[PDB]
Write a protein that binds this DNA or RNA. Structure first.
Lengths: 121, 114, 205, 53, 125
RNA sequence: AAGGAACUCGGCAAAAUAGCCCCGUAACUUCGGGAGAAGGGGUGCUGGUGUAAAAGCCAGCCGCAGUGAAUAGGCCCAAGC
RNA sequence: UAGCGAAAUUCCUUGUCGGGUAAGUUCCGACCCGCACGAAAGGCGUAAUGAUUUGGGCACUGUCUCAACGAGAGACUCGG
RNA sequence: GGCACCUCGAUGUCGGCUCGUCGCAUCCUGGGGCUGUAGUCGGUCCCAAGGGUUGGGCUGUUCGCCCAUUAAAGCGGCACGCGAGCUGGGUUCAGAACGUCGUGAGACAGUUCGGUCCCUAUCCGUCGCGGGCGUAGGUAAUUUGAGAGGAUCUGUCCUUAGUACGAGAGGACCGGGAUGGACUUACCGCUGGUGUACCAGUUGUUCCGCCAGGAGCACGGCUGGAUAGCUAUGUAGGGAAGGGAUAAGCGCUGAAAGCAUCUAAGUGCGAAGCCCACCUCAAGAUGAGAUUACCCAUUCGUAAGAAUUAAGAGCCCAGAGAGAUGAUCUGGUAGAUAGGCUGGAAGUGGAAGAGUUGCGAGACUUGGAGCGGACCAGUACUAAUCGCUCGAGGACUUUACC
């Protein structure tokens, strides 16, 4: 994907907005498809949640236009674009990671986020 | 491409039933994270099939968690075994990307059954 | 040691095993038509200038039927070489089923002739910026430093392009499902339409 | 763009070397003439031995 | 191939769309070699549609033909030649149905003195 | 595609919106304005019935799209002059 | 004198602080040390008005990630 | 800084975009030493330029600052690299304004708005394709390889093992594996994107005398697509492991100097350096190679030559896997080489007519219907017919043996 894009919410975070800055690729990726750790920051947030005005945090990409072709060869899952906030590590922020997800995150270190995710696909 | 049609005609599965452009389909997939060969049933409104040969076939757009999702896979893939028509949807055109909005009456209505 | 005398008919994709949809391809797997060994003494190298593609009467020549002189019979069209040999007969030899260099096959083709192109089009530099009142876009860039009254060579700048043979390394197909007339290979095997795809293997392997 | 020095006319004709015209192959006296080209039509309507105006 | 004709496809379809009717209202026609080549592809398959005498499919050919007055006369009198339709699809084609395609023959006319234009004659039989 | 101004000194150019009707319309104001503020809705056809002076009704038929294309505002906040 | 002040005025220096901004010499608001503000060479205000100048945001987005495609004209092959 | 030696009948002087190259005073990756280094992490220098050396915000402007980073966020040179490649935010017109100076005319790099960047490639040089000759015969295939290029990068995790070390905290070296990141090659069956002679819908309008069904025009009227081919973001790939010479460094034995001493002979080890090895161009590599086959050794006083002509090769035509054109390849009927024909995909979506229902709009039956370009199989139905041109008869000298 491309960074510097506003993205919507899928977790108990209170951050209404989530725009990452740059995912590593060492220093040299311009893509964050799936299974990867990104660096978020927030511009709009709930009355709840943590904090609103430009706070560098970490995140896991969740929804894209499509990520990687499966080793099945069956093809990729969702349509629009979303992600969740990292809870300082591969922990998720809250219980209800609302909305669906795909299986192709569990092969990272993300299976606890998957456990707090209701359904996979 | 007659040797193409020989080789790629071989080894494919015949048992995939006929269907017109997209609808809600019972999907019978076998993927597993626990490496234990778990049945993964899937559903959702197919947009339509892709054309052009034994490989290139349909998607599945399941919107049923507030997120539209898709699933494109060949018919002759042995990882899937069984797929079933829930509503015999017949509309004007092939690949309903007009399905990208106005969810209600496109959702309950695509049938025009006979 | 790899009689891979043959062309493709095109580029496809098939699932092979545990599903695994793979971009798949093929070679026609015509019987090999290899001449004698031609060892190091008369000519310092080792290889075979193997004949292939079985002409009719028209496309021949008295050095071609006259290559069925110093061959035995059946003049052919194409002739390549293979160093790494087994040797059976002076003119025509044994077919596809033997494989004696490797299944990460380093396949050799003769690329698609796309023609003379733009400066970026395969030389891959940055196309110039479009907007903001600047004339400069689709032109590759300066090349001569001022301290010489010269330009250097070496920098790719243009070029009529495409008929350039390539020897790509480790194309990934296993022990091939054979036929009388197929060779499974994988995907973007180089070459072109009606191009011979002969291949020696394991030179980085 | 604008030239620097004078072309020496010998070199000018050395430019003019490959510029020459190529002779077309003409079928010669057929009956006693007249002519066509091979793969072309005579002045008497003949291509492939039959009159077509 | 199906080439650019030096004209906008409006006038490829259109200049085609004139010269076909011209090449049937006259028998054999001398014009240039490239438009002769699109005759070689197109007018063969569409007068091959002329072999079938469906009023529906010839009504699809009614786009391909247009209103004409014959000079293979006397169309205006009792019937010798039709309009552009409905009879010449047999007056031509009854000879032409046993044949398996291939109705023009193209012959390279001596080139034109105008601007060195090599032009050709196409015939139908 | 996907992403958006991250390009650049600078959303520069292009984009996109605009028609007609009907809602609705902040700020200050020198009280006119602002303002078409904004934002919203509708807009095809068939038969009725009501429209001819005259919209709206009813139902249906359809539609990817209903000023089906053309032609016809990008907006807002703020400051200086 | 009034009144305005980092001014279209302070290079004094990225003045200071706060806000916009994660990232902010530019932007705004105050501070006002005013080299060198400043009163009819008007000064401070001031809605509507501007092909204004900037600063921010929304919208839309091939500008750019990173380009690619086809249509026409020259170009280029030939005749004049 | 200084210097006035070219440049006043023109040396266009910022910054940036693009495109790079070299240098090493090496930023990371490589090795090694010392350490006030238990390790882990460090400091420190020696050899090292193979490769790589981030992206944004602000600053017109360098410098610099911030963010987040990685292997690191190198320094310079090159007309502060490049304007007959480009921009014009910067002085560097004329305006106008402020501040300040000058009575004034104006000025003060002090600020700011606006402000006038042409060149139709001749040579050399570049990139790619050709002709003429040569390579003691004419050919036709094959390659070697003299030489020349390309490419070299780098995480992350696990094991070894929380072992060794270390009270501990913390955490190895070596070494195995797995796995990215760029970069770059190929190719479009996949995600697609695009598609101008494919099929649909559809606005308005003229016309096919009527309607129906159609045509034209409105950017391709608009839109849904989409065959071909092209193309990344699509798909796969690499940089592996080597050899050898080694730099630095570390060795044994050793010698003035009975000792010592990596050195003086003499022997080792030792790096992303070098070279070979991986790939490509390659005998115009005049030394023009080497091999495989064919024609052969003709006619004319032939002295000189001339003219046949073989083996061929070509013209000419068709077409594209190729392509600006040439050239390449496929072919030229002993035929699938192009076009048509036939069959099928091919995308479109249920043609038209006819009939049924319905006031109509419309629904439905015929009917996956009908249609269909560059897509494959066959088909000589046309076009590759006919013809013409160029094109060897191979010199000496020496030995072997002719």
């Amino acid at each position: 994907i491309q960074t510097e894009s506003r993205l919507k919410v899928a977790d108990n975070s209170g951050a209404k907005e989530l725009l990452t800055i740059r995912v590593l690729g060492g220093s040299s990726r311009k893509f964050a498809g799936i299974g990867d750790i990104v660096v978020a920051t927030v511009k709009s947030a709930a009355p709840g949640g943590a904090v609103k005005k430009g706070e560098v945090v970490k995140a896991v990409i969740v929804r894209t236009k499509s990520g990687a072709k499966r080793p099945d060869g069956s093809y990729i899952k969702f349509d629009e674009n979303a992600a969740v906030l990292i809870r300082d590590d591969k922990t998720p922020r809250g219980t209800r990671i609302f909305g669906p997800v795909a299986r192709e995150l569990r092969e990272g270190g993300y299976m606890k986020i998957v456990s707090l995710a209701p359904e996979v696909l | 491409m007659n040797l193409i049609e020989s080789i790629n005609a071989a080894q494919l599965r015949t048992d995939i039933p006929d269907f017109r452009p997209g609808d809600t389909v019972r999907v019978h997939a076998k993927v597993v994270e626990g490496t234990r060969e778990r049945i993964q049933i899937f559903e959702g409104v197919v947009i339509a099939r892709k054309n052009s040969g034994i490989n290139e076939t349909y998607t599945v757009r399941k919107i049923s968690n507030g997120v539209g999702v898709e699933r494109i896979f060949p018919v002759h893939t042995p990882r899937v075994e069984k797929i079933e028509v829930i509503r015999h949807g017949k509309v004007r055109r092939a690949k309903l990307y007009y399905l990208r909005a106005l969810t209600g009456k496109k959702a309950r209505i695509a049938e025009r059954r006979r | 040691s790899k009689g891979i005398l043959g062309k493709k008919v095109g580029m496809t994709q098939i699932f092979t095993d545990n599903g695994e949809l793979i971009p798949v391809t093929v070679i026609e797997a015509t019987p090999n038509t290899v001449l004698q060994v031609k060892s190091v003494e008369t000519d310092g190298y080792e290889a075979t200038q193997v004949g292939f593609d079985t002409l009719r009467e028209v496309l021949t020549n008295k050095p071609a039927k006259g290559h069925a002189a110093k061959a035995n019979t059946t003049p052919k069209r194409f002739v390549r070489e293979f160093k790494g040999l087994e040797g059976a007969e002076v003119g025509a030899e044994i077919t596809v089923d033997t494989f004696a260099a490797g299944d990460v096959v380093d396949v050799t083709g003769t690329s698609k002739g796309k023609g003379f192109q733009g400066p970026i089009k395969r030389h891959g530099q940055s196309r110039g910026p479009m907007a903001h009142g600047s004339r400069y876009h689709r032109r590759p860039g300066s090349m001569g430093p001022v301290a010489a009254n010269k330009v250097p060579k070496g920098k790719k700048l243009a070029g009529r392009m495409g008929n350039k043979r390539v020897t790509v390394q480790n194309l990934v197909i296993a022990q091939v499902l054979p036929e009388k007339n197929v060779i499974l290979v994988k995907g973007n095997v180089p070459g072109a339409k009606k191009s011979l795809i002969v291949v020696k293997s394991a030179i980085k392997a | 763009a604008v030239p620097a020095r004078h072309t020496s006319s010998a070199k000018k004709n050395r430019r003019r070397t490959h510029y020459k015209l190529t002779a077309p192959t003409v079928t010669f006296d057929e009956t006693t003439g007249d002519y066509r080209h091979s793969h072309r039509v005579s002045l008497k309507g003949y291509y492939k031995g039959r009159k077509v105006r | 191939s199906n080439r650019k004709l030096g004209r906008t496809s409006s006038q490829r379809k259109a200049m085609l769309r004139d010269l076909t009717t011209d090449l049937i209202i006259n028998e054999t026609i001398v014009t240039t070699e490239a438009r002769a080549k699109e005759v070689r592809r197109t007018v063969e398959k569409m007068i091959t549609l002329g072999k079938k005498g469906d009023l529906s499919a010839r009504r699809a050919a009614a786009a391909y033909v247009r209103n004409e007055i014959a000079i293979k006369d006397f169309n205006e009198e009792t019937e010798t030649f039709p309009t552009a339709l409905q009879k010449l699809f047999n007056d031509l084609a009854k000879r032409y149905e046993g044949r398996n395609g291939g109705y023009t023959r193209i012959l390279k006319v001596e080139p034109r003195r105008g601007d060195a234009a090599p032009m050709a004659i196409i015939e139908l039989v």
